[PDB]
Coordinates of C-alpha atoms and ligand atoms in Angstrom, one line a residue:
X5 CA 36.4 -10.6 -3.2
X6 CA 39.0 -13.3 -3.0
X7 CA 42.6 -12.1 -3.3
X8 CA 44.2 -12.7 -6.7
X9 CA 47.0 -15.2 -7.3
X10 CA 50.6 -14.5 -8.4
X11 CA 49.6 -15.8 -11.8
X12 CA 46.3 -14.0 -11.9
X13 CA 47.9 -10.6 -11.0
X14 CA 50.5 -11.3 -13.7
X15 CA 47.7 -11.5 -16.3
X16 CA 46.4 -8.1 -15.0
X17 CA 49.8 -6.3 -15.1
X18 CA 51.1 -8.0 -18.2
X19 CA 52.8 -5.7 -20.7
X20 CA 53.9 -7.4 -23.9
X21 CA 57.7 -7.6 -24.1
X22 CA 58.3 -5.6 -20.9
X23 CA 61.1 -6.7 -18.6
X24 CA 60.1 -8.0 -15.2
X25 CA 61.5 -5.3 -12.9
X26 CA 62.9 -6.1 -9.5
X27 CA 60.2 -3.9 -7.8
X28 CA 57.6 -5.9 -9.7
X29 CA 59.0 -9.4 -8.9
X30 CA 59.2 -8.3 -5.3
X31 CA 55.4 -7.7 -5.3
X32 CA 54.7 -11.1 -6.9
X33 CA 57.0 -13.1 -4.5
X34 CA 55.4 -11.4 -1.5
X35 CA 51.9 -12.0 -2.8
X36 CA 52.9 -15.7 -3.2
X37 CA 54.0 -16.0 0.4
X38 CA 50.8 -14.4 1.7
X39 CA 48.8 -17.2 0.1
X40 CA 51.2 -19.7 1.8
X41 CA 50.5 -18.2 5.3
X42 CA 46.9 -19.3 5.9
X43 CA 47.9 -20.8 9.3
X44 CA 49.2 -17.5 10.8
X45 CA 47.4 -15.1 13.0
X46 CA 45.0 -12.5 11.6
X47 CA 47.4 -9.6 12.6
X48 CA 50.3 -11.3 10.9
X49 CA 48.2 -11.8 7.8
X50 CA 47.3 -8.1 7.9
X51 CA 51.0 -7.1 8.2
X52 CA 51.9 -9.1 5.1
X53 CA 49.3 -7.2 3.1
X54 CA 50.7 -4.0 4.5
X55 CA 54.2 -4.9 3.1
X56 CA 52.6 -5.9 -0.2
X57 CA 50.9 -2.5 -0.4
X58 CA 54.2 -0.8 0.3
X59 CA 56.1 -2.7 -2.4
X60 CA 53.3 -1.8 -4.8
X61 CA 53.5 2.0 -4.6
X62 CA 57.3 1.8 -4.5
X63 CA 56.9 0.2 -7.9
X64 CA 54.4 3.0 -8.9
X65 CA 56.6 5.8 -7.5
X66 CA 59.5 4.2 -9.4
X67 CA 57.8 3.8 -12.8
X68 CA 55.2 6.6 -12.9
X69 CA 54.6 6.0 -16.6
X70 CA 54.7 2.2 -16.6
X71 CA 51.9 0.5 -18.5
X72 CA 51.5 -1.7 -15.4
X73 CA 50.3 1.1 -13.1
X74 CA 46.5 1.0 -14.0
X75 CA 46.3 -2.7 -13.1
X76 CA 48.5 -2.2 -10.0
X77 CA 46.2 0.6 -8.7
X78 CA 43.4 -1.9 -9.0
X79 CA 45.5 -4.4 -7.1
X80 CA 45.8 -1.9 -4.2
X81 CA 42.0 -1.9 -4.1
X82 CA 41.9 -5.7 -3.8
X83 CA 44.3 -5.5 -0.9
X84 CA 41.8 -3.2 0.8
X85 CA 39.0 -5.8 0.1
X86 CA 41.2 -8.5 1.6
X87 CA 41.4 -6.7 4.9
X88 CA 37.6 -6.8 5.3
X89 CA 37.7 -10.4 4.4
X90 CA 40.3 -11.1 7.1
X91 CA 38.2 -9.1 9.6
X92 CA 34.9 -10.7 8.7
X93 CA 36.4 -14.2 9.0
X94 CA 38.2 -13.7 12.4
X95 CA 35.3 -12.8 14.6
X96 CA 35.5 -14.0 18.2
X97 CA 33.6 -13.0 21.4
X98 CA 35.0 -10.1 23.3
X99 CA 36.1 -10.4 26.9
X100 CA 33.0 -10.0 29.0
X101 CA 34.0 -6.7 30.6
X102 CA 31.8 -3.7 30.5
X103 CA 33.5 -0.3 31.0
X104 CA 32.2 3.1 32.2
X105 CA 34.1 6.2 33.3
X106 CA 33.2 8.9 35.7
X107 CA 36.0 11.2 36.8
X108 CA 36.5 14.7 38.1
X109 CA 33.6 14.7 40.6
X110 CA 31.1 12.6 42.4
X111 CA 29.0 10.3 40.2
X112 CA 25.3 11.3 40.0
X113 CA 22.3 9.0 40.7
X114 CA 21.2 9.5 37.1
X115 CA 24.4 7.7 35.8
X116 CA 24.2 4.9 38.4
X117 CA 20.6 4.2 37.5
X118 CA 21.4 4.0 33.8
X119 CA 24.4 1.8 34.7
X120 CA 22.3 -0.4 36.9
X121 CA 20.1 -1.2 33.8
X122 CA 23.2 -2.8 32.2
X123 CA 24.2 -4.6 35.3
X124 CA 20.8 -6.3 35.8
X125 CA 20.6 -7.5 32.2
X126 CA 24.3 -8.7 32.0
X127 CA 25.2 -11.2 34.7
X128 CA 27.9 -12.7 32.6
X129 CA 29.6 -9.3 32.2
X130 CA 31.9 -7.6 34.8
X131 CA 30.7 -4.1 35.1
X132 CA 33.6 -1.8 36.0
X133 CA 33.1 2.0 36.6
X134 CA 36.5 3.6 36.4
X135 CA 37.2 6.6 38.5
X136 CA 40.3 8.6 39.6
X137 CA 40.7 8.6 43.4
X138 CA 43.2 11.5 43.1
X139 CA 40.9 13.8 41.2
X140 CA 37.4 14.2 42.7
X141 CA 37.8 18.0 42.7
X142 CA 38.3 18.8 39.0
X143 CA 34.7 20.0 38.3
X144 CA 34.7 21.9 41.6
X145 CA 37.8 23.8 40.6
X146 CA 36.6 24.6 37.1
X147 CA 33.2 25.6 38.5
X148 CA 35.0 28.1 40.8
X149 CA 37.3 29.5 38.1
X150 CA 34.5 29.8 35.6
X151 CA 32.2 31.4 38.3
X152 CA 34.8 34.0 39.2
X153 CA 35.3 35.0 35.5
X154 CA 31.6 35.2 34.8
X155 CA 31.2 37.6 37.7
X156 CA 34.2 39.8 36.8
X157 CA 32.9 39.9 33.2
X158 CA 29.5 41.0 34.5
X159 CA 30.9 43.8 36.6
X160 CA 32.4 45.3 33.4
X161 CA 28.8 45.1 32.1
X162 CA 26.9 46.9 34.9
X163 CA 25.9 50.0 32.8
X164 CA 25.9 48.5 29.3
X165 CA 23.1 45.9 29.7
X166 CA 20.4 47.1 27.4
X167 CA 22.5 47.5 24.2
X168 CA 24.1 47.7 21.7
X169 CA 26.2 44.6 20.7
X170 CA 26.9 43.7 24.3
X171 CA 25.0 40.4 23.5
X172 CA 25.9 36.9 24.7
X173 CA 28.7 36.8 22.1
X174 CA 30.8 39.5 23.7
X175 CA 30.2 37.9 27.1
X176 CA 32.1 34.7 26.2
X177 CA 34.8 36.4 24.2
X178 CA 35.7 38.6 27.2
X179 CA 35.0 35.9 29.9
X180 CA 37.4 33.6 28.1
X181 CA 40.2 36.2 28.4
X182 CA 39.7 36.1 32.1
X183 CA 39.2 32.3 32.3
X184 CA 42.5 31.8 30.4
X185 CA 44.5 34.0 32.8
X186 CA 43.0 32.4 35.9
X187 CA 43.4 28.9 34.4
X188 CA 47.0 29.6 33.6
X189 CA 47.6 30.9 37.2
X190 CA 46.5 27.5 38.5
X191 CA 48.5 25.4 36.0
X192 CA 51.6 27.3 36.8
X193 CA 50.9 26.6 40.5
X194 CA 50.2 22.9 39.9
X195 CA 53.3 22.5 37.8
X196 CA 55.7 24.1 40.3
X197 CA 54.2 22.0 43.1
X198 CA 54.8 18.8 41.1
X199 CA 58.5 19.8 40.6
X200 CA 58.7 20.3 44.3
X201 CA 57.2 16.9 45.2
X202 CA 56.3 14.4 42.4
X203 CA 54.4 12.3 44.9
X204 CA 51.8 15.1 45.4
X205 CA 48.2 14.0 44.8
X206 CA 46.1 16.1 42.4
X207 CA 43.2 16.8 44.8
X208 CA 45.7 18.0 47.5
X209 CA 47.1 20.6 45.2
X210 CA 43.6 21.5 44.2
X211 CA 42.3 22.1 47.8
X212 CA 45.4 24.1 48.9
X213 CA 44.8 26.2 45.8
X214 CA 41.0 26.6 46.4
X215 CA 41.4 27.5 50.0
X216 CA 44.2 30.0 49.4
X217 CA 43.0 31.8 46.3
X218 CA 39.2 31.5 46.4
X219 CA 38.5 31.1 50.1
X220 CA 37.0 27.6 49.9
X221 CA 36.5 25.6 53.1
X222 CA 39.1 22.8 53.6
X223 CA 36.7 20.6 55.6
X224 CA 33.8 20.9 53.1
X225 CA 36.1 19.8 50.3
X226 CA 37.5 16.8 52.3
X227 CA 34.0 15.7 53.0
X228 CA 33.1 16.0 49.3
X229 CA 36.0 13.7 48.5
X230 CA 35.1 11.3 51.3
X231 CA 31.4 11.1 50.1
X232 CA 32.5 10.8 46.4
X233 CA 34.9 7.9 47.1
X234 CA 32.2 6.3 49.3
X235 CA 29.5 6.5 46.6
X236 CA 31.6 5.0 43.8
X237 CA 33.0 2.2 46.0
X238 CA 29.4 1.3 46.7
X239 CA 28.9 1.0 43.0
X240 CA 31.5 -1.3 41.4
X241 CA 34.2 1.4 41.7
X242 CA 37.5 0.5 40.0
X243 CA 40.2 3.0 41.0
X244 CA 42.7 3.6 38.2
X245 CA 45.3 4.6 40.7
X246 CA 45.2 0.9 41.9
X247 CA 46.2 -0.5 38.5
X248 CA 49.9 -1.2 37.7
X249 CA 50.8 -2.3 34.1
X250 CA 48.1 -0.4 32.0
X251 CA 50.0 2.9 31.9
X252 CA 51.3 4.1 28.6
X253 CA 53.4 6.9 30.1
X254 CA 52.7 9.0 27.1
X255 CA 48.9 8.4 27.3
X256 CA 49.1 9.0 31.1
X257 CA 50.8 12.3 30.4
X258 CA 48.0 13.4 28.0
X259 CA 45.4 11.9 30.3
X260 CA 46.8 14.2 33.0
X261 CA 46.9 17.1 30.6
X262 CA 43.1 16.9 29.9
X263 CA 42.2 16.2 33.6
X264 CA 44.4 18.7 35.5
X265 CA 45.2 21.5 33.2
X266 CA 42.3 21.6 30.6
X267 CA 39.6 20.3 32.9
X268 CA 38.1 18.4 30.0
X269 CA 36.7 15.3 31.6
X270 CA 35.3 14.1 28.3
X271 CA 38.7 14.3 26.7
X272 CA 40.3 12.6 29.7
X273 CA 37.7 10.0 29.3
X274 CA 38.3 9.6 25.5
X275 CA 41.9 8.8 26.5
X276 CA 41.1 6.4 29.3
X277 CA 38.5 4.4 27.5
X278 CA 40.8 3.3 24.6
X279 CA 43.6 2.6 27.1
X280 CA 41.3 0.4 29.2
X281 CA 39.8 -1.4 26.2
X282 CA 43.3 -2.2 25.1
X283 CA 44.5 -3.5 28.4
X284 CA 41.2 -5.1 29.5
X285 CA 39.1 -5.9 26.4
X286 CA 35.4 -5.5 26.2
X287 CA 32.6 -3.0 25.7
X288 CA 32.8 0.7 26.6
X289 CA 29.7 2.9 27.1
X290 CA 29.0 6.4 28.2
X291 CA 26.9 6.6 31.3
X292 CA 24.0 8.1 29.4
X293 CA 23.6 5.0 27.2
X294 CA 20.8 2.6 27.8
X295 CA 20.6 -1.1 26.7
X296 CA 19.0 -2.2 23.5
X297 CA 15.3 -3.1 23.4
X298 CA 14.3 -6.7 22.8
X299 CA 13.3 -7.0 19.0
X300 CA 10.1 -9.0 19.5
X301 CA 8.7 -6.7 22.3
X302 CA 7.0 -4.0 20.1
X303 CA 7.1 -5.9 16.8
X304 CA 3.2 -6.3 16.7
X305 CA 2.8 -2.6 17.2
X306 CA 3.0 -0.7 13.9
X307 CA 4.6 2.7 13.8
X308 CA 2.0 5.5 13.1
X309 CA 3.1 6.6 9.7
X310 CA 3.4 10.4 10.5
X311 CA 6.1 9.6 13.1
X312 CA 9.9 9.4 12.5
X313 CA 12.0 6.3 13.0
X314 CA 13.9 8.4 15.6
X315 CA 10.9 9.6 17.7
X316 CA 9.5 6.0 17.7
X317 CA 12.8 4.6 19.0
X318 CA 12.7 7.4 21.5
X319 CA 9.0 6.6 22.5
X320 CA 9.9 2.9 22.7
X321 CA 12.1 3.8 25.7
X322 CA 9.7 6.2 27.4
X323 CA 7.1 3.4 27.2
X324 CA 9.3 1.2 29.3
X325 CA 9.9 3.9 31.9
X326 CA 6.2 4.6 32.3
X327 CA 4.8 1.3 33.4
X328 CA 7.9 -0.5 34.7
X329 CA 9.4 2.6 36.3
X330 CA 13.1 1.5 36.4
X331 CA 14.4 5.1 36.2
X332 CA 12.5 7.6 38.3
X333 CA 12.1 10.9 36.4
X334 CA 12.4 9.6 32.9
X335 CA 10.4 11.7 30.4
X336 CA 7.2 10.4 28.8
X337 CA 6.4 13.7 27.0
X338 CA 6.6 12.1 23.6
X339 CA 4.7 9.0 24.7
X340 CA 1.8 11.1 25.8
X341 CA 1.5 12.6 22.3
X342 CA 0.2 9.2 21.2
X343 CA -3.4 7.9 20.7
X344 CA -5.1 6.2 23.7
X345 CA -5.5 2.9 21.9
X346 CA -1.8 2.9 20.9
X347 CA -0.7 3.9 24.4
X348 CA -2.7 0.9 25.6
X349 CA -0.9 -1.2 22.9
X350 CA 2.3 -0.5 25.0
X351 CA 0.7 -1.3 28.3
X352 CA -0.5 -4.6 26.7
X353 CA 3.0 -5.8 25.7
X354 CA 4.5 -4.7 29.0
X355 CA 1.8 -6.5 31.0
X356 CA 2.8 -10.2 30.8
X357 CA 6.5 -9.6 31.2
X358 CA 8.5 -10.7 34.3
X359 CA 12.2 -10.2 34.2
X360 CA 14.0 -7.1 32.9
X361 CA 15.8 -9.4 30.5
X362 CA 12.6 -9.9 28.5
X363 CA 12.5 -6.0 28.1
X364 CA 16.1 -5.1 27.4
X365 CA 18.3 -7.2 25.1
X366 CA 21.3 -8.7 27.0
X367 CA 24.7 -8.4 25.3
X368 CA 25.6 -12.1 25.3
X369 CA 28.3 -13.1 22.9
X370 CA 29.6 -10.1 20.9
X371 CA 31.8 -11.1 18.1
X372 CA 34.6 -8.9 17.0
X373 CA 37.9 -9.1 15.1
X374 CA 41.4 -8.5 16.5
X375 CA 41.9 -6.1 13.5
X376 CA 39.1 -3.8 14.6
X377 CA 37.3 -1.7 17.2
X378 CA 33.5 -1.6 16.7
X379 CA 31.9 1.8 17.2
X380 CA 28.5 3.5 17.5
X381 CA 26.9 5.6 14.8
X382 CA 24.7 8.8 15.1
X383 CA 23.5 10.5 12.0
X384 CA 25.5 8.5 9.4
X385 CA 28.8 9.3 11.3
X386 CA 30.8 7.3 13.9
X387 CA 30.5 8.3 17.5
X388 CA 32.6 6.8 20.2
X389 CA 30.0 6.9 23.0
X390 CA 30.0 3.1 22.6
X391 CA 33.0 1.0 21.6
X392 CA 33.9 -2.7 21.4
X393 CA 37.4 -4.2 21.3
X394 CA 39.2 -7.4 22.2
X395 CA 42.1 -7.0 24.6
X396 CA 45.3 -5.8 22.9
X397 CA 43.5 -5.5 19.5
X398 CA 45.4 -4.1 16.5
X399 CA 43.0 -1.3 15.9
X400 CA 43.2 -0.1 19.5
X401 CA 46.9 0.5 18.9
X402 CA 46.0 2.5 15.7
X403 CA 43.6 4.5 17.8
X404 CA 46.1 5.1 20.5
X405 CA 48.7 6.1 17.9
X406 CA 46.3 8.6 16.3
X407 CA 45.8 10.3 19.6
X408 CA 49.5 10.6 20.3
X409 CA 50.4 11.8 16.8
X410 CA 47.6 14.5 17.0
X411 CA 48.6 15.6 20.6
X412 CA 52.2 15.9 19.4
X413 CA 51.2 18.4 16.8
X414 CA 49.1 20.2 19.4
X415 CA 51.6 20.3 22.2
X416 CA 54.7 21.0 20.1
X417 CA 52.9 24.2 18.9
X418 CA 50.8 25.1 21.9
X419 CA 53.4 24.9 24.6
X420 CA 55.7 27.5 23.1
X421 CA 52.6 29.6 22.2
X422 CA 51.7 29.5 25.9
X423 CA 55.3 30.6 26.9
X424 CA 55.6 33.4 24.3
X425 CA 52.2 35.1 25.0
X426 CA 51.2 37.5 27.7
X427 CA 47.4 37.0 27.6
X428 CA 44.6 34.9 25.9
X429 CA 44.5 37.0 22.7
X430 CA 48.2 36.9 22.0
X431 CA 48.6 33.2 22.7
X432 CA 45.8 32.4 20.3
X433 CA 47.5 34.6 17.6
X434 CA 50.9 32.9 18.1
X435 CA 49.2 29.5 18.1
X436 CA 47.1 30.2 15.0
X437 CA 50.2 31.4 13.1
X438 CA 52.4 28.5 14.2
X439 CA 49.8 26.0 12.9
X440 CA 49.5 28.0 9.7
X441 CA 53.3 27.9 9.1
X442 CA 53.3 24.1 9.2
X443 CA 49.9 23.5 7.5
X444 CA 49.5 21.7 4.2
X445 CA 46.8 19.9 2.1
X446 CA 46.8 16.8 4.2
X447 CA 46.4 18.4 7.6
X448 CA 44.8 21.9 7.0
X449 CA 41.4 20.7 8.2
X450 CA 42.9 19.2 11.3
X451 CA 44.7 22.4 12.1
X452 CA 41.6 24.5 11.8
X453 CA 39.7 22.1 14.0
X454 CA 42.3 22.2 16.9
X455 CA 43.0 25.9 16.6
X456 CA 40.4 26.7 19.3
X457 CA 41.6 24.1 21.8
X458 CA 42.1 26.5 24.8
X459 CA 38.4 27.4 24.5
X460 CA 37.0 23.9 25.0
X461 CA 34.3 23.9 27.7
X462 CA 34.2 27.7 27.9
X463 CA 32.7 28.8 24.7
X464 CA 29.9 27.7 22.3
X465 CA 30.6 25.5 19.3
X466 CA 34.1 24.5 20.4
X467 CA 34.8 21.0 19.0
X468 CA 38.6 20.4 19.1
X469 CA 38.2 17.3 21.4
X470 CA 36.5 15.5 18.6
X471 CA 39.6 15.5 16.5
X472 CA 42.2 15.0 19.2
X473 CA 40.7 12.2 21.3
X474 CA 37.2 11.5 20.0
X475 CA 35.4 10.3 16.8
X476 CA 38.0 11.7 14.4
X477 CA 40.7 9.4 15.8
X478 CA 38.6 6.4 15.0
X479 CA 37.8 7.2 11.4
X480 CA 41.5 8.1 11.3
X481 CA 42.4 4.6 12.6
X482 CA 40.0 3.0 10.1
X483 CA 41.8 4.8 7.3
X484 CA 45.1 3.6 8.6
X485 CA 43.8 0.0 8.7
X486 CA 42.1 -0.1 5.2
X487 CA 44.6 2.1 3.4
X488 CA 47.7 0.6 5.2
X489 CA 48.8 3.9 6.7
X490 CA 49.8 5.2 10.1
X491 CA 49.2 8.9 9.6
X492 CA 45.7 9.2 8.3
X493 CA 44.3 12.7 9.0
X494 CA 42.8 13.7 5.6
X495 CA 39.7 11.4 5.6
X496 CA 38.3 9.8 2.4
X497 CA 36.4 6.9 3.8
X498 CA 32.6 7.2 3.1
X499 CA 29.8 6.0 5.4
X500 CA 29.3 2.6 3.9
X501 CA 33.0 1.8 4.3
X502 CA 32.8 3.0 7.9
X503 CA 29.7 0.9 8.5
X504 CA 31.9 -2.2 8.6
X505 CA 32.9 -1.2 12.1
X506 CA 29.5 -0.4 13.6
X507 CA 28.3 -1.4 17.1
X508 CA 25.6 -4.0 16.6
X509 CA 22.6 -1.8 16.5
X510 CA 20.0 -4.0 18.2
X511 CA 22.3 -4.1 21.3
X512 CA 22.1 -0.5 22.4
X513 CA 19.6 2.4 22.8
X514 CA 21.5 5.6 22.1
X515 CA 18.5 7.9 22.1
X516 CA 18.0 8.5 25.8
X517 CA 17.1 11.6 27.8
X518 CA 20.5 12.2 29.3
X519 CA 22.3 12.0 25.9
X520 CA 20.3 15.1 24.8
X521 CA 22.6 17.1 27.0
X522 CA 26.4 17.5 26.7
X523 CA 28.7 18.3 29.6
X524 CA 32.0 19.1 27.8
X525 CA 30.5 21.4 25.1
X526 CA 27.4 23.6 24.2
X527 CA 25.8 25.1 21.1
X528 CA 24.7 28.6 20.4
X529 CA 21.2 28.0 21.7
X530 CA 22.3 27.0 25.3
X531 CA 24.9 29.8 25.3
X532 CA 22.2 32.4 24.8
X533 CA 19.9 30.5 27.1
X534 CA 22.3 30.7 30.1
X535 CA 23.7 34.1 29.4
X536 CA 20.2 35.3 30.3
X537 CA 20.3 33.3 33.6
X538 CA 23.8 34.6 34.7
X539 CA 22.6 38.1 33.9
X540 CA 19.3 37.5 35.7
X541 CA 21.2 36.6 38.8
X542 CA 22.0 40.3 39.3
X543 CA 18.5 41.6 40.0
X544 CA 17.3 38.4 41.6
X545 CA 19.3 37.5 44.8
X546 CA 19.4 37.3 48.6
Ligands
UPG28 O1 32.4 15.5 34.6 C1 32.5 14.6 33.7 C2 31.9 14.7 32.5 C3 32.0 13.7 31.5 N1 32.7 12.6 31.8 C4 32.8 11.5 30.8 O2 32.4 12.0 29.5 C5 31.7 11.0 28.8 C6 30.7 11.6 27.7 O3 30.1 12.7 28.2 P1 28.8 13.3 27.5 O4 28.1 14.2 28.5 O5 27.9 12.3 27.0 O6 29.4 14.3 26.4 P2 29.0 14.1 24.8 O7 28.5 15.5 24.4 O8 28.0 13.1 24.6 O9 30.4 13.7 24.2 C7 30.7 13.2 22.9 O10 32.0 13.6 22.5 C8 33.1 13.0 23.3 C9 34.3 13.0 22.4 O11 35.3 13.9 22.8 C10 32.9 11.6 23.8 O12 33.6 11.4 25.0 C11 31.5 11.1 23.9 O13 31.5 9.7 23.8 C12 30.6 11.7 22.9 O14 29.2 11.3 23.1 C13 30.9 10.3 29.9 O15 30.5 9.0 29.6 C14 32.0 10.3 31.1 O16 32.8 9.2 30.9 C15 33.3 12.5 33.1 O17 33.9 11.4 33.4 N2 33.2 13.4 34.0
MN29 MN1 33.4 21.3 61.4
MN30 MN1 41.1 -8.2 32.7
MN31 MN1 26.6 11.8 25.7

């Protein structure tokens, strides 16, 4: 897995009596100077490989029938290997910052209690919980608009309840058409106000809108902000509106897009986390992630063979929150399925244990490369609920560029679709066709997955965020890194190649209670589940 020499590569690509072409010589020279660079920075060493990989397929593009090509395709694979080598030999401990994000509303006690677990166990880490002091009223506003649409949709249902295909499917379809119109009425309002006075604060536009159009009480809203700001200050609150240099004005624009217009706090958070990791360095976590459990704790307790590796890891946590009681309310439903003598095997190991540090594994020194961003896995796929990156890392720029490039395709096609259409149905048809007209082999999948963007948060199985700002943008970045590209969208990296970038697994417990629920999306089950409730709030009332 060592990178071949000039002379060694020459053996590989040797064709008897063939002229040494300029494009070939160029490759060999450049490979020579890479091996005479060993003092340089990792990033600089990566960039030299990237030029070497560009000179190589220039050769291949030039001589498509050259008897050198086979060997040179293999060379390209060794370049890929060399990246992993540079990565694996450039590890260094991350900045000891620990990031969380809660925006668009008041932080709940459930999040703070999960966060506090991290704080207690990591003295040497600066816990920062980013919030947006200008935007406490996003969730409120969406809750009101969604509310109004639900109701209107249900009034056009008051004599069709029992059948036929007025099921939960038709409810969302038709609710969405109303949500879109109402949402657009607000956006148009917000946008005209910002033209008026650019200094205007998001929440101030929001309250004026809520009081004028939906009869909300000004005072109640100002007290909600005041409380929300109070709570988060009390809890290591870092206001983003206080920071100066961080702002990538492009990212800020898209951060604002997801926060104010789309009301996707998860998307907004996807955007803010990578920006903060880049500027600050460290470890990012979702507020529903708990720390890793100490290896040796339950090592002497053998997993009952009829029980999954997953449920056991899940029990391991519930066992902690039964006896030690760090989080009040934490489920033990799975723990109670166990045999008495095994339940007492857990009481036994949790007996002679003093500090929370002997229970949860502290993060300590986490080693990472400048060339990478480490990421959590769930079900043999990356998931960005947990990230690690050095300040100003190369791969963070790749991630940020993936986001921008994807939003450029989105916005360039969506914005005019918004302007040309006269309702939800027409906008979606214009958007769908515009993406069709510019779709090809290398982006078709991406186009399909972002087609339903305007539906995010309002309808079941809507997953566009994943491929704009979430996991997809990381696997995209990893393909950029390994394959030497800047445009990766058609993914060909398999799990074991993606596993190079994994969050160290012993240093996180992903399988918590709060993770079971999602706040930006929902599946078909929950959709049906709460169609019943909304409907059942029409016979049951005051
Ligand atoms: O009102 C909200 C709601 C969510 N969030 C943020 O959203 C993040 C994740 O929310 P979660 O409820 O866990 O949604 P998931 O269904 O788990 O979202 C998945 O998909 C998203 C990718 O778009 C990622 O943000 C998440 O890491 C990933 O777990 C949280 O940590 C918060 O930072 C807010 O700030 N305010
Ligand atoms: Mn009063
Ligand atoms: Mn810093
Ligand atoms: Mn989650």
